[PDB]
């Protein structure tokens, strides 16, 4: 039954997104926070769809009310919630339920107080008695910010989700965008993906039953005391953190899961910012964090430069039980040709050991690799080889001859000798530990390979966070062969 | 069918303009937007006639109400869309078709939130239910401009045509325009002109399936990523875009086309302004890109140079049979002085080839222009000579002498000897991708010469058109000279 709810969600956004391009996370995310009781907040200049997914979402659902108002310099409470006669609210916000207030940061005194509570209890002050006001979604769009010192301040700070909408850059998204066909004031929306008033009722107790991992916690609270150290980095509420995780545990509801997914972290990077120079902060350390401690993606790393240092230290050290003997070749030429080692060897890039270290090009190296198909050319024709150093840079030239005994004596600027060898096919202490670790990746990978079917995930970090995974496991299968 | 259409909409727009003197150009905008759709803007004193162009629009159709009301700083919402009772909306706006709505930057914070919904939905609240309107021209006139920070931008950034009228300046308009007898309040459209109700409807789905070409999607994302980059350009934004090719897809619909024309990019000139200081900024960009990338006349000037470099390529190789023999002109100085030929070469940034090739500035060269203006004052009153190489960067500075055989000896870091020489007065291979480049500007002027006759399109933009294609083609005919 929970791995059914994933297919039905997937199927709802996805004709909501049919008339808006590039702005798929400007709606997956009000339905998530339509769903769990949260609200959201667009900020940009007038004019990137922030007014139509207000009366997009409403669709979705079997019994919703649009409320479209723009807040003026000289507005008055009784034009917002209805003229009292006790007060005349047919069809206005104490009995609607997806309401869009443009142009927030400039109403009156006596608005913004009437909206604070109706978030936190869900309730108006409708004359006498109170009445509960069925509020599933709460969007707010704007321009500018607020100043630093004043009363908007306290509305900003209790809204969850902070959209950053901006216009579209890419030119094959604006071709079919600038001449759509598609109306928005249609019901792309069929009749059998709404949802009813009796599964909401249900949903809202389901998502705080969401069991909280022992591995998911050390990932909130090292965020938390990273932010604070930063000097930059702004200023994060108690209320913001409990408001986070009703975010993040409905995420995984709809996603066919029971706990909170670690993969669910990205959605922080609108939570936690409140203007422009924060932007750029808080998407730079949930980045770090996601590609550094989620996965364990930099404690591997720490792991195998370790191990690769001390396998490479144990392979110069037994070079003298190994060494490396050039069969010759029949056949009618000229020049002596040699051949290398047939089945013993297959590799292209393959890597050459030797004894006694020399300084080429006025420093120490430890290990160098050569070409395969550029080391047959010299065996044969004869000439100059090129090869690089330490696995890095360019492939200079060195001084290689052909010893009497059949080796590879490499000679310097003092005409020192250097027998090259080949590694052998890995020692057991290496082994214990690369199994270890080759056995850490493939369980936070089997992890990762189940949950990045959320709908609730961007696309642009799928690019970034398995390219992290296939570096690792890219460099870890290097030092077996 | 299709050709019939533009001579139709002609013999409409000719008999409105009859009472209006200077005024063709806001009767011509208004009568396309009405059948598209569309809003119109005005501005200008009171006193040059800006509410007769409402009552006057009225006559091209045959089931058309007019309502004419003045916003004042009192008016309240009752009084514009009935009074209820459930609303009174016999003859107002809900029902009516052309609205008219003078000082509107002054109505209440109620009478604009209703105006945002009757536009993008075209429906209007009436207690429970809602009801279309069969809104077809939105005219709205005043005289002063709003504030940079208010309410009243988010209507003014959704209309569409922004017009600039002004007072008569010519004499000869204003004394027929004092005496004149036609009245403003007949009928002066015929009874064959008037569209019916049935055709209406059918021309509004018609105007949505107009193609829109690859060509035509160049020149709209090359003005948007322009008006970006200049700080003093004004913000274009997404929804502008949108409902600009509801407007550019409706002049061709009506002149006998079925495809977008690049030709009726002019019209955005009063689309994309907003006060008196960007007013002549987008008039600017418009032109150069409307002379520009419009019939590819840029286009092919980036071209013809390929075919340049490729014909100076392959008179360099054979430049030993005509050299370049300076003459000594006449009179005894000091140093001896050079003059370049007479008659035989009158450019002022000609060519100059070269035998052996050099390595200046650290990159090859195969042909040096000099300034007419600049060599005659270094070969006789000495000093440093400044030349570009081939044909772009900066004049840098080269080491040029005079020869004992009077020649031009260019020398280099080397010290070697290259004598220059000049172009004699065409091979088979530089003709036939000559031929291809020159048959493509008759191909873009045939275009031109045959939906020249589009109503919408003023005047005075083409005579700038017609003087930027025979600058193109004036070009390409010198170097097959
Ligand atoms: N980025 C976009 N992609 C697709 N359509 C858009 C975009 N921005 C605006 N639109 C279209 O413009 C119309 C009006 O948008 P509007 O409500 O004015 O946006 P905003 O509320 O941000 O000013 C909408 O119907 C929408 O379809």
Redesign the interface.
Known sequence: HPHLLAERISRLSSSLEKGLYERSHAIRLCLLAALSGESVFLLG?????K?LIA?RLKFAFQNARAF?????????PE?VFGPLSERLT??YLPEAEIVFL??IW?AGPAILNTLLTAINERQFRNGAHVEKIPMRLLVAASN?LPEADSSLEALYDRMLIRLWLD??QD?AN??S?????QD??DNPVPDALQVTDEEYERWQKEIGEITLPDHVFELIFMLRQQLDKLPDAPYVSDRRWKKAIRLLQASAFFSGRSAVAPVDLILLKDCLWYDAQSLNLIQQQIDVLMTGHAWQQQGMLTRLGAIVQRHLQLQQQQSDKTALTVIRLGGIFSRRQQYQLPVNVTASTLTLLLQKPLKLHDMEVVHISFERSALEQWLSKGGEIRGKLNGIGFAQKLNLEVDSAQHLVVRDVSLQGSTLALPGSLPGEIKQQLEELESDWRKQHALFSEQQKCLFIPGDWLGRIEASLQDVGAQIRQAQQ
């Not at 479209?68 to 008055?76: D, I, V």
Request: charged share 35%.
């Open positions: 200049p007038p004019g990137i769809a007014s009366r479209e108002y723009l807040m003026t310099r000289f507005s008055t034009e047919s069809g443009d142009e400039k500018e216009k579209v030119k604006f071709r965008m600038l001449t759509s066909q928005e004031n």
